[PDB]
Amino acid sequence: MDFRIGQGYDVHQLVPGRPLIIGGVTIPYERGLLGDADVLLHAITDALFGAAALGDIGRHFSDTDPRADSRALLRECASRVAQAGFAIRNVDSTIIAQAPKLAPHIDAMRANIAADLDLPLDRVNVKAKTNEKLGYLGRGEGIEAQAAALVVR
Amino acid sequence: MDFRIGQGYDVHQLVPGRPLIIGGVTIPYERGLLGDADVLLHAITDALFGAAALGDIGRHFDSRALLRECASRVAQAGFAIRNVDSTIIAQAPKLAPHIDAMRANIAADLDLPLDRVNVKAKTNEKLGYLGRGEGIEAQAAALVVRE
Amino acid sequence: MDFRIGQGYDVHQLVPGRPLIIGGVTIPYERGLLGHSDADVLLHAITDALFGAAALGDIGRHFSDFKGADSRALLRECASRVAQAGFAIRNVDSTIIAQAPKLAPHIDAMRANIAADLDLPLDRVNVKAKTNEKLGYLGRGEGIEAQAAALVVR
Ligand SMILES: Nc1ccn([C@@H]2O[C@H](CI)[C@@H](O)[C@H]2O)c(=O)n1
Ligand SMILES: Nc1ccn([C@@H]2O[C@H](CI)[C@@H](O)[C@H]2O)c(=O)n1
Ligand SMILES: Nc1ccn([C@@H]2O[C@H](CI)[C@@H](O)[C@H]2O)c(=O)n1
Ligand SMILES: [Cl-]
Ligand SMILES: [K+]
Ligand SMILES: [Zn+2]
Ligand SMILES: [Zn+2]
Ligand SMILES: [Zn+2]
Predict the structure, then answer these.
(1) Min Cα–Cα distance to chain B from A56, Å
(2) The domain C1-154: what is its CATH number?
(3) What CATH number was assigned to the domain covering residues B1-147?
(4) How far is the CA of A116 from the centre of ligand 6 (A)?
(5) What are phi and psi of A31, to 5 degrees?
(6) Is B125 near chain A, with CB under 8 Å?
(7) CB contact under 8 A, A94 and C52
(8) Does the domain formed by A1-153 have CATH 1.20.140.10?
(9) What's the rounded Cα separation, in Å, for the pair A1 and C1?
């Protein structure tokens, strides 16, 4: 039927003094993202609004708007996607971070995302990459996330 | 039915004495893209050629005329365009007031209704060449179907 | 009707003294990609996109970083696991970003390798090449990046 695709990007700086929260999971580390600055949840939200052609995360959830962590935002995104007429079919994503090791936390992130989107676990995927010591990502100065989402009207 | 996906990437340097044109919209700014170097339309063009497996922009070829030709070639290969999504990564200037016009431009060029075309914008949080405003990146995804 | 999408990203450093192998093609060049396998950045990105579309995690889960491993053999194994999970591949698209060397003379060969490894006809596989317009570590030729997207159906 009426399938649509969306894609999402996000990046935040990595500094001492903030906790590291990615995909709703708090990961012990000497440093955290500046923004809860959940780079993975933001990229996924963008991908979803994109698939539904609803603009972007900033247009829905403004820095200034009096009307929240990134999971609340993800859930509101999904309701808006639903109300627009679209059912979510799957999400895939990649986190690019030189450190720390993310593999142990992947199932936790998938579980949070699946819960927030009301999806079966087998329709949510999260992957992790280093940047092979290249650029600001490779130097541990920031963390990037990429997302793809498929929906149907 | 026979769906296919494509993905596109483009980046251009920001330089003095060039108009800034993105998604076919002229945006007032001290610099512009070097190449009309419309990074957004180029990424979308590559995503569409990718979905139709027709190669890339460099193997085929202003950017709106090129986007129209791309759409022509896609249809010539037997595909219909179902939707486009995209992200512009620019530290500056503010793109928000220009986005709906970009969507309208793309929709017109692809012969698509507005609700099948999306454009999003992000800064780079002051990181890398994007963060320093040395260039602007675009990413695109397209879904087509062979009927 | 049960379609799924996946996306993939990879980057490797370019160093002297290594073969340059992208899309399974050995490309004449004074530097090659550094990695534990043959460091084929394009095949790895595609492999990740396919595992991602099937929700089977990532290339590191399946093939733990394989010393000098042929990344085409890895791609074929990935395709096998994707099929075993119940998915057929419908198409792959990809972009390589590199300052140098010129990739255009090798693109059709890369496409042919990928099609062979995924048992797809050529018309469902696409490879695009881009410079990074002189920007950043890619612009300085310090590494090569690949991006991929895949559509599958269960
Ligand atoms: N150069 C930019 C970057 C981002 N935005 C908008 O500002 C928000 C902040 I991420 C998003 O809604 C985005 O659309 C913008 O208007 N101009
Ligand atoms: N390293 C590169 C980068 C780009 N190109 C080709 O040159 C054109 C110019 I963007 C594109 O079509 C692309 O296929 C190439 O042959 N080698
Ligand atoms: N920050 C990171 C980066 C990567 N990995 C895992 O390590 C492998 C080496 I690229 C990746 O494919 C992924 O499986 C990880 O656990 N944490
Ligand atoms: Cl370059
Ligand atoms: K990038
Ligand atoms: Zn964010
Ligand atoms: Zn361009
Ligand atoms: Zn690799």
Answers:
(1) 5
(2) 3.30.1330.50
(3) 3.30.1330.50
(4) 17
(5) -145, 165
(6) yes
(7) yes
(8) no
(9) 8
